[PDB]
């Protein structure tokens, strides 16, 4: 159980950028993921989540149709992209980490994390 | 990590197994083995009485 | 589906019985949980579906609820305890970070 990233630093407003999440040290296949976003003095807002297979990716409304999420199981990675920011995503990022072992052929309730990745701040 | 000084090639692998060598014929009647779980502790001992 | 907790914020000598509530807005049943976060670093989870803790915690963390209200208490305060503590539902996908609650020496 070992999760960093990718990607981190200072970006232009209304930029694009790749951001990165890696994983390893556990049975990836079965769990589901997210990210969430610590700015600073505030809250915890969640980004976006993707259910093991893949299939269903979901977003919250300050997130629909900016950002692209997507899950490489094969090499144990979270990709994430990022358009049309703003001055608000001033954040940092820790990849989290569903503990719920759904099968590769389901999909359903994820929201009960144990584990996070080492937090990269990006600031915009 | 813990283990004494590994002398020949070495590596920081995570191993799966960890081996014990005792002498001819020993026993280890006389002492107690510590276990350690992420949901707790575990010890192995043995006795008659 | 939104939160609201208490006490926002509060500084207490270390060993007190500190307790902290949760608010859903709405009937969750038992799906809720809470976690410590360190300012500066990562957080981890220590209780969840209310009354039941991580395997990695100590029986000092404690909590329950159900419906809207919900609470996670402390037995005694311990110096490693400043930190954050937050809460989130899992009742919709769409889901609720809490309002976050922090601890403080005196
Ligand atoms: C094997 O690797 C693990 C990580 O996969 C190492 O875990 C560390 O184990 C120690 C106890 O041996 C933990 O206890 C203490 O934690 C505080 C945390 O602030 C630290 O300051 C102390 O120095 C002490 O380490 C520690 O939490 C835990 N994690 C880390 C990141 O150090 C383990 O030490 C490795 N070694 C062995 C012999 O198993
Ligand atoms: C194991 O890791 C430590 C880290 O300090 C290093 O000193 C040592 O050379 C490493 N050995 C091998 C075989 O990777
Ligand atoms: C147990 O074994 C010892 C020798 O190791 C023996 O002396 C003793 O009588 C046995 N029985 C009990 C009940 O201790």
């Known amino acids: 159980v070992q999760l960093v990233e990718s990607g981190g630093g200072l970006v232009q407003p209304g930029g694009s950028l790749r951001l990165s999440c890696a994983a390893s040290?556990?049975?990836?296949?079965?769990?589901?993921m997210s990210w969430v976003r610590q700015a600073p003095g505030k809250g915890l807002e969640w980004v976006s989540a993707?259910?093991?297979?893949?299939?269903?990716?979901y977003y919250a409304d300050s997130v629909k149709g900016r950002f692209t999420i997507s899950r490489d199981n094969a090499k144990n990675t979270l990709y994430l992209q990022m358009n049309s920011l703003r001055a608000e995503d001033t954040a940092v990022y820790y990849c989290?980490?569903?503990?719920?072992?759904?099968?590769?052929?389901?999909?359903?309730?994820?929201?009960?994390?144990?584990?996070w990745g080492q937090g990269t701040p990006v600031s915009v | 990590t813990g283990r004494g000084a590994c002398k020949g090639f070495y590596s920081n692998a995570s191993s799966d197994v960890i081996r014990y060598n005792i002498n001819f014929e020993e026993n280890l009647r006389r002492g107690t083995i510590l276990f350690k779980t992420s949901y707790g502790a575990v010890v192995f001992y043995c006795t008659n009485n | 589906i939104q939160m609201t907790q208490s006490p926002s914020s509060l500084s207490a000598s270390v060993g007190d019985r500190v307790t902290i509530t949760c608010q859903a807005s709405?009937?969750?049943?038992?799906?809720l949980n809470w976690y410590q976060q360190k300012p500066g670093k990562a957080p981890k989870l220590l209780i969840y579906?209310?009354?039941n803790l991580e395997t990695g915690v100590p029986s000092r963390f404690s909590g329950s609820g159900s419906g809207t209200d919900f609470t996670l208490t402390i037995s005694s305060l311990q110096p490693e305890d400043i930190a954050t503590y937050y809460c989130?539902?899992?009742?919709?996908?769409?889901?609720?970070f809490g309002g976050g609650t922090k601890v403080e020496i005196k």
């Open positions: 989130q539902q899992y009742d919709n996908l769409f889901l609720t």
């Open positions: 579906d209310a009354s």
């Open positions: 993707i259910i093991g297979s893949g299939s269903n990716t």
């Open positions: 040290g556990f049975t990836f296949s079965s769990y589901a």
């Open positions: 709405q009937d969750i049943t038992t799906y």
């Open positions: 989290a980490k569903d503990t719920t072992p759904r099968p590769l052929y389901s999909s359903g309730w994820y929201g009960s994390f144990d584990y």
